[PDB]
């Protein structure tokens, strides 16, 4: 009735979304085969936001998996919940991109874009009132960022009123594993700013800084980095599936976050994460949850909001919890610390309370924050673009795909507007 069509692209996008569906299916009591085996009644009431219905009482997700190489479809099909996906939703080309934005955008990713848009137009018109889409990708590869922005351009030229949302994993600066990634990421941010409603920023550097510092894990892997992205991929959409004392969908947080239509890059974070020895030493009350949304170490971007000004702030609270204690603690963070808040917006906080917590938990909390300390995420990409671009470094890999050097020069200055557009609100 308020359906969400999932899109997900690349090896990064197909390995984030495979764990996210293991989070949702347990949250709604769905087995590895698909059948419903829950206990409550609220688990089967708004399941149609994310799940279709097959025959025999078996639920199949609305997920369309996209890739340019054929080797990340076998990883997902034969994983833990790989048998819940309809096999027509998998899209794969028989030759990759190989860390290249141009092969993603023009050469290889344009013969594959017209077969996914025959899939998504079959899943988007099969919704009673489609709320919007989603994306999950990375700005470092070829098919995550090249064709992953070709798709968004075709969506927002075809369904403009609907919500387009992105969970971007923008490239990590100082744990980096590709020389040719700043060409991919700089060329991809003009396509984000004109064709997305919201966009979240995730760095894999700052997902490691949780798993070493906060959780005190011995050997984390990418299975515990996808485990945290799905924690905040479900808290944004938890008031759409479970009732509350105060609701907020994906649109009401978008109405209340962006003041100007070019300023939609945010910073998620999830509160009740506890290390294994400190698990028994903590109790679950309300100020235990607002001390870890707003802690600057907790954030899922590797940029610090003490260097900038919070334009607006969100919060999503889950559990059965008191409306006075919710409300009095967000006034509390506004008043002790009032140089991290913009003047011209007097209240900077939106709050929402959902009743049904994550399974086995009593209370929970989620965050979405908009900053002028996120123009420090693009200037560390600009400094490593024009340091490399001014000597025409890896340029033969891109210009021989059918490009031009002026197409680079505009993506210098279209992203350099967002540096100086955001800059005038710190003044």
């Amino acid at each position: 009735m308020r359906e969400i069509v999932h899109l997900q692209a690349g090896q990064c996008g197909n390995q984030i979304g495979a764990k996210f569906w293991e989070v949702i299916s347990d949250e709604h009591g769905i087995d590895p085969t698909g059948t419903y085996h829950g206990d409550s009644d609220l688990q089967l009431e708004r399941i149609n936001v994310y799940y279709n219905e097959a025959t025999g009482g078996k639920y199949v997700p609305r997920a369309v998996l996209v890739d340019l190489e054929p080797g990340t479809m076998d990883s997902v099909r034969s994983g833990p919940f790989g048998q819940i996906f309809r096999p027509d939703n998998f899209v794969f080309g028989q030759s990759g991109a190989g860390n290249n934005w141009a092969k993603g955008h023009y050469t290889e990713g344009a013969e594959l874009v017209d077969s996914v848009l025959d899939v998504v137009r079959k899943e988007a018109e099969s919704c009673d009132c489609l709320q919007g889409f989603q994306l999950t990708h990375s700005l470092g590869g070829g098919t995550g960022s090249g064709m992953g922005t070709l798709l968004i351009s075709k969506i927002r030229e075809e369904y403009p009123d609907r919500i387009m949302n992105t969970f971007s994993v923008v490239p990590s600066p100082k744990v980096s594993d590709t020389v040719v990634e700043p060409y991919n990421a700089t060329l991809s941010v003009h396509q984000l700013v004109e064709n997305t409603d919201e966009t979240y920023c995730i760095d894999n550097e700052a997902l490691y800084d949780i798993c070493f510092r906060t959780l005190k894990l011995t050997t984390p892997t990418y299975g515990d980095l996808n485990h945290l992205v799905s924690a905040t991929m479900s808290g944004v959409t938890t008031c759409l599936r479970f009732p509350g004392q105060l609701n907020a969908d994906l649109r009401k947080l978008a109405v209340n976050m962006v003041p100007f239509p070019r300023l939609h890059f945010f910073m998620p974070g999830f509160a009740p994460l506890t290390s294994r020895g400190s698990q028994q030493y903590r109790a679950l009350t309300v100020p235990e949850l607002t001390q870890q949304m707003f802690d600057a170490k907790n954030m899922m971007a590797a940029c610090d909001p003490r260097h900038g000004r919070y334009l607006t702030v969100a919060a999503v609270f889950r559990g059965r919890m008191s409306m006075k204690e919710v409300d009095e603690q967000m006034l509390n963070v506004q008043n002790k610390n009032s140089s991290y808040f913009v003047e011209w917006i007097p209240n900077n906080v939106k709050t929402a309370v959902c009743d049904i917590p994550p399974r086995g938990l009593k209370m929970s909390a989620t965050f979405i924050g908009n900053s002028t300390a996120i123009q420090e995420l693009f200037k560390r990409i600009s400094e490593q673009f024009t340091a490399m671009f001014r000597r025409k470094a890896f340029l033969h890999w891109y210009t021989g795909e059918g490009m031009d050097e002026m197409e680079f020069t505009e993506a210098e200055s279209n992203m350099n507007d967002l540096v100086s557009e955001y800059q005038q609100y710190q003044d």
């Binding site: 054929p70 479809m73 076998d74 028989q94």
Partner: peptide
């Protein structure tokens, strides 16, 4: 060892 039985296309299989 690599096991690419799921991912090979139906044109090109054994």
């Amino acid at each position: 060892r690599k096991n690419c039985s799921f991912s090979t296309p139906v044109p090109l299989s054994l």
